[PDB]
Structure 1
Amino acid sequence: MIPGGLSEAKPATPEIQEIVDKVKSQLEEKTNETYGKLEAVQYKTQVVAGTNYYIKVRAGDNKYLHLKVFKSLPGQNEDLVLTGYQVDKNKDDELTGF
């Protein structure tokens, strides 16, 4: 069993692309990623020190990347601080258990 509480995981459109465009800046220079050129097909969400969003987005035609966009409130300073994510995978990029 794994904690977290991934809320859901429905289809994703450019609305997840914003959550994706909001973290791809930090995600770009975090793991030298890039995002933005990927299509988010679905997403989920969790509740912790604020609110995060997990996304099942792909970056080609045989690979997926799960990002972890996180928003706070009690320490706004962070706000949409995607501190978790994964890219270039085709075996452990399922939902959030990636």
Structure 2
Amino acid sequence: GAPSATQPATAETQHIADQVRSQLEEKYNKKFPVFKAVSFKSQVVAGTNYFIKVHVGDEDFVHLRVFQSLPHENKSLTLSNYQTNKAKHDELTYF
């Protein structure tokens, strides 16, 4: 995907923003005096997320979250996140 051209916000966009305002207050304690959607861009996403347990020596492991976009023969990847100080038998939980 390639994000589209800048599009004007609609009533949906504002509904989405109203939801997000509450989430930002509740979990990241972020407050604003107004929260008015102005515009957006869209981006198609289609691929595979990998959650990978990697041994990094002795008792040490890390977990990786890596995204691989379509098509199937695409081999370029994005490291989206990771977890430090993981142990051998830890579960691969989403993050």
The TM-score with structure 2 as length reference comes to 0.36
Larger CA Rg, structure 1 vs 2: 2
Structure with greater proportional strand content:
2
The TM-score with structure 1 as length reference comes to 0.35
